Amino acid sequence: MSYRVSTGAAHAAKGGGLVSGDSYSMMELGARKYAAAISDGARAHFESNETIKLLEKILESGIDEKIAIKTINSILSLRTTDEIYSTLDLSIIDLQDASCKFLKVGSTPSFIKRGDQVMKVQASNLPIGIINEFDVEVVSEQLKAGDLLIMMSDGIFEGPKHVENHDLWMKRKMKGLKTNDPQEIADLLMEEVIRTRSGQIEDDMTVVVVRIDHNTPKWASIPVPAI
Amino acid sequence: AMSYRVSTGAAHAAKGGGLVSGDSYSMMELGARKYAAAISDGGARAHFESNETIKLLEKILESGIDEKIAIKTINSILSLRTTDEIYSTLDLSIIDLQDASCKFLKVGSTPSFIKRGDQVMKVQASIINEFDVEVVSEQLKAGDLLIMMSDGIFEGPKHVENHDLWMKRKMKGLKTNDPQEIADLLMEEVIRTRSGQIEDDMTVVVVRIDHNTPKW
Amino acid sequence: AMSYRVSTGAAHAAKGGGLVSGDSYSMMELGARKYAAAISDGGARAHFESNETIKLLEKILESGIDEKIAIKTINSILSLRTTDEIYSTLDLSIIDLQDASCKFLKVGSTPSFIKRGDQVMKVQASIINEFDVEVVSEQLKAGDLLIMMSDGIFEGPKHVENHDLWMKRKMKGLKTNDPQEIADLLMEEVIRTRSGQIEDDMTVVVVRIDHNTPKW
Amino acid sequence: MSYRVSTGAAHAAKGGGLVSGDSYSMMELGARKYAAAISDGARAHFESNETIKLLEKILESGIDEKIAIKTINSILSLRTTDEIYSTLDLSIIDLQDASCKFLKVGSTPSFIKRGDQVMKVQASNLPIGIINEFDVEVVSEQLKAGDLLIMMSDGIFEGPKHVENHDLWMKRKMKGLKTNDPQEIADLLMEEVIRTRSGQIEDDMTVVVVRIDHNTPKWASIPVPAI
Ligand SMILES: OC[C@H]1O[C@@H](O)[C@H](O)[C@H](O)[C@H]1O
Ligand SMILES: OC[C@H]1O[C@@H](O)[C@H](O)[C@H](O)[C@H]1O
Ligand SMILES: [Mn+2]
Ligand SMILES: [Mn+2]
Ligand SMILES: [Mn+2]
Ligand SMILES: [Mn+2]
C-alpha cells in the first residue's frame, strides 16, 4: 500500500520580515520518496528535471505563448528516443501571488473548483498555424484562496465506462463534493470511478489535488518592537 | 504580507492492481516561493530531484558505509563549495515511502524530533569533522511526527538552559495531529517567549507519516 | 613552474564493423589542472559532461530555434547565476564528430577564427541582450583549424587598431598545422608586442579537424 | 568513419604568473562529440558522471585504499539495474605534478611505456579479506615526462587469436614501437591485432593512448618586468 505523508510548515524572517537566510523545501516522488530540507546561510534543495528546468525558463521570459509552444516543442524533440512519448502535466504555483502556470503535453485536462464554479483549465486561444508535434498546451490562471485544483492521468479521466463527454461528467462528481480535503477528494474520485467497473481497472490511475490557502495564523499578528 | 500555502493529496493504482505503473507523479515546494505538481503517463524520469551537491550526499546516505567514512567524504564534498553555499547548515530528511525508513543528514544543524504517541525522541547518533556532519537512520511508524527546525526556532526560547527539554515538553503538549497546526503552534510558542521579538529567522517543518488505507 | 601537458590518441571499431559498439570512450581536460580518460565495455552513460548551466545552453543550441528566442532564453538562464559565475564570458565550441558541424556560443567573448587552407574566416553572426550572447553554426572541413582565445590574447597586441586584421595576418603566416605549436606561436607573438609584459591572463585554444582514415 | 580532432593549448597568468581569472577546458565523447570552452571571470565547464564524481571524492580524501575499494563497491551497487554491469577504466592525471590515479572495474589492465621499461599498472597489494563484487582495482603511479600510457577494452587485449599470456604479448608489440605519437600507436595496435584474424573482428575494439609532456615553450622564458 505505501505510506502517505502529510506536512505543514511555518516561517518568519528576522526583525519581523523582509528576506531570510533560512530556506526550506520539500519534494515527493509519488509512492516512493519524500524529502525535506532546511538551510541557514543561492541554492534550492530541489529542482526539476533538466528538461523541465528548460521548459520552465521559456514559460517565464516575455515570449508570446504561440512562440513558446513552438519552442517547447522543439526542446521536447531533443528527448532520448524515447521518453517524451508520454504525457506531461505540470502546474506551477507562485506562492507570492497565487498565479498558476500550466504546461500540458498530450495530456487530459485539469480542473479548478471555485466555490462551485468549476471552470476547466483551457488556454484562451488554441493556436493554429504551426506544427504542434507533442500536442503542447500552456495556460495561466490567477488562483484564489480556496481553489481546488485537480489533476489526473487518462486512466481516470476516461475510466467512466459510460463514456460520452467526460468533461461534463467530472464537473458533475466535482460539484457534488461535501469535503474540502485534498486527500479525501483524491481518494473519493478514485472510488467514484472504480465503482464504475467494480474492481480491476483497465489502465493506470492517478489523481492529484491541491488546495490553495491564505490563512494568516495568530503568530503572524504578534507585533515586533519599534526602531 | 502572507505567503500562500498549499495543501495537497494524491491517490494512485496500477493496471489490474498491480505490479507497477507507467503512471507517475511528483510535487515539490520551495518554501514561501514556489509549488509544482506533475503527472506523467509514460513514467521513468522523476520530475524533480535534489540539486547537485545533495544528490551526492544522498548517494552516500543510501550506501550503508561506516559513519566515519561517510563523514570524511561528506566533508570533502561540502569543502569544495562556493562562497555562497556556504555551505551554511543543512538539515535533510529522506523518507522511504515503501517501508518508512528515514535517513537524516545534518551538517551543523540543530536537532530534530519525532513524536511517537506520547513519547518524544530526539534524532541524534553516536575525531575531525570539518563541517560537523552527523548521519542517522531510524525506522518510522504510522502516526509518527517529524519536526525539523532552524536554530532561530530551536534556540529562540529566552532564558532556557535545555532546549531539548523545552522542545520535548511543548511537543508532549500538542493536542493535535495536524502538521500545519503543529508548525504554527510551535512558532507561536517560541515567539511569545521573546515578546514578539524575532532575534533570528525562524523555520519549522513538520511531517506526519500515514499508512491509511482507503475504500478501493 | 610549467604545467604538464598531455597528448592523446584513440582508435575504435565495432563488432563485424559494425552498426554500433557497446565499447565507449571519453576524455576531458581542465586546463593546467586535470586530465582524465575513460573506457567502458557496456557503454550508455557518457563519462563526462557539461556542468549544469552549460547542459541547458547546449540544449538550446541543438534546437535550431530563432537566434532571438535562443538569446532571450540564454539571457534568462545566465541572469540567474551566482555571485561567482559571474557569469564572466563564455566561449563554447561544440563539434559534431559525425558530420563536423559546430555550434558556437559566445557570452560576451572575443571572436574566434577558422583557418581553411589559406583563408582565415572569423566566427560571427547577424534589441536587448543583457549578457551579449551570440549563437553561430558552421560546417567545418578536414584540415580546418579553429582558434579560440581570451581577450588577454586577442586584445593583447599594443597599438593595434584592428585585432581581427592582426590575428588573420598572423594566422595566414603559420607554417605549421600542429595545434600545440600554433597555440604556442600565437602566444609568443602576442607577448613580444608588449615586451614580456602580460597586461592580462592569456588563453589560446586551437583545434584541428581530421578525417584521416587508417589501414584497417 | 567519423572525424578525429587534434588539439593544443597555451595559457599564462597576468603579471607573469600566480593564478588566473581565465579557465579553459575541453572534452571528447569518443566518436560523437568534441567540446571546448574558455572563460574569463569556481566553475569547471566539464565534469564526470555523477557516479564518477563520487568515486572520485573517495579516491581523494585520506582513506586507506582497502577501505576505499570497499566503499567504491558499495556506491557501485547503487547503480540502476543495470549500468555498472560493464567495465570502467579510468585514469586521472594531475597536471601539476604528473601523479596518476587508476580506477579499474572489471577491466583489462593498462600499460605505461617508459623509455622502453614497460611496467604494467598493478596495485602493490591486491587486498584479500573482503567482498569485491565489481572486481575493483585502484592504483597510483608517479608519471614522468615522456611516459606512454595505453588503455584498451577486452576486444583488443584478448584479440590475439594465438592466446596465452596476453600480458607479455602486449609489452612485446609495445617495446617494438618506432613512433611516439599517441594516434599512431593507437592506430598501430589496432592493426597489430586485426591482422591476427584478417578483417571482421569478434568483439568491440577500442584503445586510447596518452603521452605526458613537460616541454617549456620559448614564450615561457620571456621575462616580465620588475616591481
Ligand atoms: O500534505 C501536503 C504536502 O505533501 C508533500 O508531499 C508536498 O511536497 C507538498 O509540499 C505538501 O502539499
Ligand atoms: O589531440 C589531443 C586532445 O584530444 C582531446 O579530445 C582531449 O580532450 C585532450 O584534451 C587532448 O589530448
Ligand atoms: Mn494511461
Ligand atoms: Mn539561524
Ligand atoms: Mn581577460
Ligand atoms: Mn567486449
Residue numbers in the entry:
A (entry chain B), D (entry chain B): 589 to 629, 634 to 819
B (entry chain A), C (entry chain A): 588 to 629, 633 to 716, 722 to 811
Paper excerpt:
To gain structural insight into Mn2+ chelation in SpoIIE, we sought and obtained crystals of SpoIIE(590–827) from drops prepared from solutions in which the citrate was replaced by acetate and in which the protein was pre-incubated for 30 min with 2 mM MnCl2. The “citrate” and “acetate” crystals are essentially isomorphous, and a domain-swapped dimer is again observed. In the latter structure, we observed a single high-occupancy manganese (Mn2+) ion in the active site. The manganese ion in each active site of SpoIIE is coordinated by the side-chain carboxylates of Asp628, Asp746 and Asp795 with the Asp628 ligand provided by the partner subunit in the domain-swapped dimer. The octahedral coordination and the coordinating ligands (contributed by three carboxylates and two water molecules) are conserved in SpoIIE. The three metal ions in PstP, MspP, STP and tPphA are almost exactly superposed following an overlap of the structures based on protein Cα positions. There does not however appear to be capacity to bind a third Mn2+, equivalent to Mn3, since only one of the coordinating protein ligands is conserved, this being Asp746 whose equivalent bridges the Mn1 and Mn3 metal ions in the other bacterial phosphatase structures.
It has 10 putative membrane-spanning segments at its N-terminus and a PP2C-type phosphatase domain at its C-terminus. The pathway of σF activation begins with the dephosphorylation of SpoIIAA∼ P by SpoIIE and culminates in the displacement of σF from the complex with SpoIIAB by SpoIIAA.
